[PDB]
C-alpha cells in the first residue's frame, strides 16, 4: 500500500547498463525493504519531458523526486565539481566514483544545497569515437566536430584542435546520424547505451595509468521529498545512498565497458580500437597540462583554492585506485 511514490527521471534508455544493473535493483531494494510503503517509478529517455540539462532542477524544484544527470550540463553552476573534468585525472569508474563522492562530501556542501545525494560519482574512462577518421595521432582530430559533456572537456577538445559542439550525450545519436558531428567522447558502455557501435566504428584509447577524462555525475533526490518521508522510511533511503552506491555505479560501468571493448577486439562487433603508445599519449597529456594550469588560475580568480582542490581530487583517486589493487 504505497504511502509515497518516488518518480526517478533520467536521459538514457531503459536498456542502458546503469538502468538495468543499478536503477532496477535500487527500485527492488527500496520497494521490498519499505514493505511497499515506498513505490519507485523509473522514467528513462526523458519520458516526463524537458531536456537532460534541466534534470538537476527537476529534482531540486520537486517536478520529480530523483534524477540522474551530469553536473557539467549547467556551465559554471558546480565550480568545485569541475576539478573531476581535468585531463588524465581519473582511473576506473569505481575508484574515481569513490574519490568524487568523498570529495563532494568534503568540498561541495554549498554547491549541492537542496538535493540529497544518493550517489555523487563519475563515468568510467572516456575515449574517442568517430565515424570515418581513425585517430592514430593528435593531428588526426584537427577540425573534427566532436562533443564532450561540459565546458572544461570541450575546452580540452578545442585545445587538442577539435571543433567541440556542446550537447548532452542523449542527443549524440541524432547529431552523429544526421551529419552534425564527426564523433563524440564517451566511455565505451555509453556507446552500448546509445546504440552507436555501428555508427562510430573508430575508437581511440591511451597508454598509461590515467584515462583521458571523466565528468562528475549525481543520482540526486529532492531534499524536500527526503525531508517529507516519515522517520521510518528516511533510513531505507539512507541504506541505499552514499559512497558505496557511488563505487557500485562506477563498477557497473567498468564491467559494461569491458563487455563492449572485448566484443570489438574479438570482431563480434564491427569497429577498430586504436591504442596510442606512451610517446604519442604524452603529447595529449602535454595539452592537458595547459587545461589544468588555466583551471587552477581561473579557480584562484573565483576565490577557490585551486591547488588544494586538485591535490585532494588527485590524492583521493590515487588512494581508492591503490585500495582497489590491494584487495
Ligand atoms: O558525456 C555525457 O554527456 C554523458 C556521459 C555518460 C556516460 C556514461 C553513462 O552511463 C551516462 C552518461
Ligand atoms: Mg526541493
Ligand atoms: Mg560508418
Amino acid at each position: 500500500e504505497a504511502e509515497y511514490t518516488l518518480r526517478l527521471h533520467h536521459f538514457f534508455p531503459a536498456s542502458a547498463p546503469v538502468h538495468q544493473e543499478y536503477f532496477l535493483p535500487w527500485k527492488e531494494a527500496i520497494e521490498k525493504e519499505s514493505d511497499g510503503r515506498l513505490a519507485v517509478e523509473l522514467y528513462p529517455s526523458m519520458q516526463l519531458g524537458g531536456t537532460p540539462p534541466s534534470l538537476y532542477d527537476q529534482a531540486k524544484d520537486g517536478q520529480v523526486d530523483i534524477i540522474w544527470t551530469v553536473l557539467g550540463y549547467n556551465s559554471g553552476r558546480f565550480p568545485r565539481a569541475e576539478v573531476f573534468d581535468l585531463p588524465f585525472l581519473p582511473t576506473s569508474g569505481a575508484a574515481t566514483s569513490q574519490a568524487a563522492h568523498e570529495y563532494a562530501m568534503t568540498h561541495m556542501q554549498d554547491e549541492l544545497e537542496g538535493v540529497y545525494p544518493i550517489a555523487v560519482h563519475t563515468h568510467s574512462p572516456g575515449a574517442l569515437h568517430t565515424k570515418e577518421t581513425r585517430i592514430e595521432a593528435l593531428e588526426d582530430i584537427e577540425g573534427l566536430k566532436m562533443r564532450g559533456p561540459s565546458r572544461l572537456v570541450n575546452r580540452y577538445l578545442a585545445k587538442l584542435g577539435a571543433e567541440p559542439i556542446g550537447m548532452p550525450v542523449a542527443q549524440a545519436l541524432e547529431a552523429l546520424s544526421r551529419g552534425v558531428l564527426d564523433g563524440t567522447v564517451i566511455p565505451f558502455e555509453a556507446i552500448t547505451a546509445m546504440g552507436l557501435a555501428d555508427i562510430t566504428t573508430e575508437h581511440t584509447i591511451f597508454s598509461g595509468d590515467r584515462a583521458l577524462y571523466t565528468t562528475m555525475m549525481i543520482v540526486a533526490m529532492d531534499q524536500d521529498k527526503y525531508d517529507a518521508l516519515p522517520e521510518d522510511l528516511q533510513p531505507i533511503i539512507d541504506a541505499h545512498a552514499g559512497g558505496r552506491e557511488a563505487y557500485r555505479i562506477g563498477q557497473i560501468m567498468d564491467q559494461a565497458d569491458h563487455r563492449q571493448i572485448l566484443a570489438i577486439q574479438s570482431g563480434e562487433q564491427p569497429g577498430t580500437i586504436t591504442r596510442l603508445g606512451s610517446e604519442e599519449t604524452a603529447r595529449w597529456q602535454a595539452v592537458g597540462q595547459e587545461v589544468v594550469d588555466e583551471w587552477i588560475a581561473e579557480a584562484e580568480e573565483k576565490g577557490l583554492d585551486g591547488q588544494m582542490l586538485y591535490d585532494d581530487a588527485t590524492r583521493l583517486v590515487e588512494r581508492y585506485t591503490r585500495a582497489a589493487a590491494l584487495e
Side-chain angles (χ1 to χ4, degrees):
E1 299 166 357
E3 192 177 358
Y4 292 82
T5 295
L6 307 177
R7 294 202 302 170
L8 190 154
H9 195 207
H10 73 77
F11 54 84
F12 247 8
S15 51
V18 172
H19 189 101
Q20 290 298 306
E21 308 312 329
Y22 189 74
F23 298 137
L24 273 177
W26 193 94
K27 164 197 161 64
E28 189 194 350
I30 296 295
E31 290 188 344
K32 190 192 180 169
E33 293 166 24
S34 73
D35 195 27
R37 290 173 57 202
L38 285 179
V40 180
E41 293 176 343
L42 303 182
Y43 296 96
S45 306
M46 299 306 304
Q47 256 161 32
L48 303 176
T51 65
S54 78
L55 280 165
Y56 189 85
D57 281 337
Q58 290 196 24
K60 190 178 148 163
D61 299 342
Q63 293 172 248
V64 300
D65 305 303
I66 306 179
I67 60 90
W68 187 42
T69 196
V70 178
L71 292 180
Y73 285 178
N74 312 131
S75 189
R77 183 170 193 179
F78 309 103
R80 295 177 153 98
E82 283 188 338
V83 76
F84 272 86
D85 294 348
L86 291 169
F88 287 94
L89 178 136
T91 59
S92 64
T96 311
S97 285
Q98 187 184 350
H101 192 98
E102 178 63 12
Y103 172 94
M105 293 310 101
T106 312
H107 293 295
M108 288 168 51
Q109 307 97 318
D110 301 324
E111 222 163 75
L112 290 175
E113 173 108 310
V115 308
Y116 170 102
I118 296 167
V120 182
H121 73 89
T122 68
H123 63 60
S124 60
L128 295 155
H129 315 274
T130 46
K131 286 183 304 191
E132 279 286 304
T133 305
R134 179 167 299 161
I135 299 170
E136 285 167 340
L138 191 50
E139 290 80 13
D140 299 331
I141 205 175
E142 286 174 9
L144 291 190
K145 298 167 189 80
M146 299 298 281
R147 179 231 70 103
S150 68
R151 68 132 203 140
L152 209 48
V153 169
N154 287 337
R155 176 113 183 122
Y156 182 42
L157 293 167
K159 272 178 161 278
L160 290 165
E163 302 186 6
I165 304 183
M167 63 178 79
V169 67
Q171 281 177 318
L173 168 67
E174 179 171 311
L176 282 159
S177 61
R178 291 187 184 253
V180 175
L181 291 174
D182 294 317
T184 183
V185 294
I186 28 166
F188 275 89
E189 67 94 7
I191 297 293
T192 318
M194 292 297 305
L196 276 173
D198 296 300
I199 295 191
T200 57
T201 56
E202 294 292 330
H203 318 273
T204 284
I205 61 173
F206 297 84
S207 291
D209 56 7
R210 297 292 189 273
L212 183 70
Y213 77 96
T214 192
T215 204
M216 201 182 291
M217 305 186 62
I218 193 162
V219 180
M221 183 170 203
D222 190 359
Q223 187 70 52
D224 296 284
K225 192 57 172 229
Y226 176 85
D227 291 339
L229 296 179
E231 298 283 6
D232 48 353
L233 294 188
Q234 292 180 19
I236 304 312
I237 299 307
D238 299 338
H240 297 289
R244 299 181 180 273
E245 305 303 314
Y247 184 91
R248 172 60 177 164
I249 297 164
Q251 171 186 34
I252 287 162
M253 289 166 152
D254 291 329
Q255 289 174 353
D257 274 0
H258 177 74
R259 290 198 303 275
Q260 187 58 93
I261 296 170
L262 218 74
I264 295 156
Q265 293 281 21
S266 76
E268 297 160 67
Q269 276 289 315
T272 300
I273 297 174
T274 293
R275 181 176 196 274
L276 309 183
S278 50
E279 179 179 9
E280 177 59 28
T281 294
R283 295 175 72 204
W284 300 67
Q285 285 163 343
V287 174
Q289 180 75 37
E290 297 170 39
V291 175
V292 172
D293 292 355
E294 217 168 63
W295 182 85
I296 290 181
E298 292 175 8
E300 176 61 27
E301 298 180 324
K302 282 171 277 194
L304 299 176
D305 187 336
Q307 181 65 58
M308 188 224 63
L309 291 179
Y310 188 70
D311 282 348
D312 275 302
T314 53
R315 190 184 52 75
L316 284 168
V317 167
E318 81 178 33
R319 176 198 208 113
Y320 298 133
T321 302
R322 207 167 54 237
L326 202 68
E327 296 195 50

